[PDB]
């Protein structure tokens, strides 16, 4: 067979140890999920330094905690805007997930609070920037470099899926690089805790699994499809399915055809054909052997999964870092005041925040 006795025994033991880890991790998650923390700071505890990101959600600012001197990323949401955009449930869900999970590649929420006008989530500052920026600048990542990041996503999805969380928001724009060169996953509004199927059309066109596009009920296998898109984009510099308009992207996604750069290794192409598999009965991550089909694939044969988890692998790329509060790996944005109305807005809607 493919493995001799020693290798087969070591792999078997490793897979059993994963099950043991995940069972404990689920116990820990469920305790925090059922008793969430709240109101752990206030706005005047922080100096606001610079805007690091913006979106329909609001903004993320670099802040400095006055008492400790520590820098953090503060996400600021306007309650009335969240209501207008029909994002109440997603916003509450993001905070509840963030305060309950614990994993080395998931960003840590350190404080949360609200005031008359806004909601605030204060997370560890991840100074290395978005993977997106580095990928577009470098052009493409080598297969070892892409593999280092991919392994972290595999472990993170193995953790999330064990908690019955479907992630649904994978893309380079949503992955940050920390000071040691490891990945931080930050966005959880569109994650959903369900054991079976769900039906919402959500995500980003290039990363949507066919079953989402086709308005089917779908499950956690959509995350393994999205991993295939991510690995492809990291290693090629462009995603597997693109076009001028989303409709044409969707036609390519559902077609069952994917083409590869000539520099892709055969091992990489084999992995990608099994992740970018339109037939759910054949997609890696969705079969009887679960995540093991991915972790044991030839493309990952050099990956030491425990060493990645322990953060003992030397990263292939270390972002520039001049000191705490360095913002050079993020873009520049126009600075807007943060206003706090003298009247509470939307109190009922956000009671649980």
């Amino acid at each position: 067979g493919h493995m001799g006795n020693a290798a087969a025994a070591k792999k078997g033991s490793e897979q059993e140890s994963v099950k043991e880890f995940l069972a404990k991790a689920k116990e820990e998650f469920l305790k925090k999920w059922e008793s969430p923390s709240q109101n752990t700071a206030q706005l005047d505890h922080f100096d606001r330094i610079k805007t690091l990101g913006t979106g329909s959600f609001g903004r993320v600012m670099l802040v400095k905690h006055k008492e400790t001197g520590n820098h953090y990323a503060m996400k600021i949401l306007d309650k009335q805007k969240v209501v207008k955009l029909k994002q109440i449930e997603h916003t509450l869900n993001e905070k509840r997930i963030l305060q309950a999970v614990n994993f080395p590649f998931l960003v840590k929420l350190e404080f949360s609070f609200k005031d008359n006008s806004n909601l605030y989530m204060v997370m560890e500052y991840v100074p290395g920037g978005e993977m997106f920026s580095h990928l577009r600048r470098i052009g493409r990542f080598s297969e070892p470099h892409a593999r280092f990041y991919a392994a972290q996503i595999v472990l993170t999805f193995e953790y999330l899926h064990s908690l019955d969380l479907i992630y649904r928001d994978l893309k380079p724009e949503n992955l940050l690089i920390d000071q040691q060169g490891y990945i931080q996953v930050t966005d959880f509004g569109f994650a959903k805790r369900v054991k079976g199927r769900t039906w919402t059309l959500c995500g980003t066109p290039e990363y949507l699994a066919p079953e989402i596009i086709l308005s089917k009920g779908y499950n956690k296998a959509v995350d393994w499809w999205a991993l295939g898109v991510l690995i492809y984009e990291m290693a090629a510099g462009y995603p597997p399915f693109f076009a001028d308009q989303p409709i044409q992207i969707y036609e390519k996604i559902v077609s069952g055809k994917v083409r590869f750069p000539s520099h892709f290794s055969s091992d990489l192409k084999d992995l990608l054909r099994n992740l970018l598999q339109v037939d759910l009965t054949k997609r890696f991550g969705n079969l009887k052997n679960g995540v093991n089909d991915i972790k044991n694939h030839k493309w990952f044969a050099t990956t030491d999964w425990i060493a990645i988890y322990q953060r003992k692998v030397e990263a292939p790329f270390i972002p520039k870092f001049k000191g705490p509060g360095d913002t050079s790996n993020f873009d520049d944005y126009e600075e807007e005041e943060i206003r706090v109305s003298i009247n509470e807005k939307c109190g009922k809607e956000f009671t649980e925040f």
Binding site: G55, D169, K171, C202, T204, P205, Y238, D244, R259
Partner: peptide
């Protein structure tokens, strides 16, 4: 080339989710 086609798509910048 495929790279040129990617540039021509206009989708080389940060991509919005469907709801945005």
């Amino acid at each position: 080339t495929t790279y040129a086609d990617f540039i021509a798509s206009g989708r080389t910048g940060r991509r919005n989710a469907i709801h945005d």
